[PDB]
Ligand binder design. Structure first.
Ligand SMILES: O=C(O)c1ccc(Oc2ccccc2)cc1
Length: 282
């Protein structure tokens, strides 16, 4: 069924909440035993949002290899993503260790450091060129190289230096700054504009490690980003683009991280973003 007609059908019948609970019901459930270990309690921002054991990213250190992050592997689309929580004051060094060890090129941030008057994530990057950051636990240095502030997003080049080997890499930081404190955007154009910028940069291409994407919990806005990207890539690839079933792609993604798409508004917004993104793709 052409998703554009499925949309109108769901919209007219106002059954978004019903579709969504159906997804919640059939989603995968796998163990998350490492996340729940007592030694890792201060490495989870939210008690109810944990990575599955089978798909969790492991830090290349013997001490404690745990970070709240998951590898989402989309086999038909040939796209991989790491979804993670916003870093905590004690996990900023772990975050940049992961970026280094997975060879990622890009970091995608979908939240503001403060929202609804509370902190949603730490300041894990430097705000001035001459004030670099050093992470002593993971032996890394991070320098701001340039910043590019647009009305609804900011782009930054960063330099990550492995202090143990003095290798350096350019990392691109893509920061969507205008998602509203409550609800979802009215239109997907700026989100759509935002996704193509990430794509252009090379950050999603198989020549690099997987892109790192985060919001506060790493499941809601983050799930919307990778669901829209993968669905548009499949409509690109297949002989029959109308055979792309967004609900089925989402259930597939939920095999790798729990809770992706947090609200029936977010589900409806993911549809809108896809239908409007199809128009450019073909
Ligand atoms: O303290 C910080 O680092 C920080 C950075 C950027 C933020 O997003 C924006 C940027 C421009 C306009 C509206 C929001 C919010 C906090």
């Amino acid at each position: 069924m052409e998703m554009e007609k499925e949309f109108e059908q769901i919209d007219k019948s106002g059954s978004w909440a019903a579709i969504y609970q159906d997804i919640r019901h059939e989603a995968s459930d796998f163990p998350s035993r490492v996340a729940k270990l007592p030694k890792n309690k201060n490495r989870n921002r939210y008690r109810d949002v944990s990575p599955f054991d089978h798909s969790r990213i492991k830090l290349h250190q013997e001490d404690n290899d745990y970070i709240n992050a998951s590898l989402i592997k989309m086999e038909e689309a040939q796209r991989s993503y790491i979804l993670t929580q916003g870093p905590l004051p004690n996990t900023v060094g772990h975050f940049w260790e992961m970026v280094w060890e997975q060879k990622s090129r890009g970091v995608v941030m979908l939240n503001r450091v403060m929202e609804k008057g509370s902190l949603k994530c730490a300041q894990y990057w430097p705000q001035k060129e001459e004030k670099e950051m050093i992470f002593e636990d993971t032996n890394l240095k991070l320098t701001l190289i340039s910043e590019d502030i647009k009305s609804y997003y900011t782009v930054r080049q960063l330099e990550l230096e492995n202090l143990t080997t003095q290798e350096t890499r350019e990392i691109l930081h893509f920061h969507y700054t205008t998602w509203p404190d409550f609800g979802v955007p009215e239109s997907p154009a700026s989100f759509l504009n935002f996704l193509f910028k990430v794509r252009e940069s090379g950050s999603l291409s198989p020549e690099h490690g997987p892109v790192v994407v985060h919001c506060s919990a790493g499941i809601g806005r983050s799930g919307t980003f990778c669901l829209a990207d993968t669905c548009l890539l499949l409509m690109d690839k297949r002989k029959d683009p109308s055979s792309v079933d967004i609900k089925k792609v989402l259930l597939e993604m939920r095999k790798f991280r729990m809770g992706l798409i947090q609200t029936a508004d977010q589900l409806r917004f993911s549809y809108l973003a896809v239908i409007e993104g199809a128009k450019f793709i073909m």
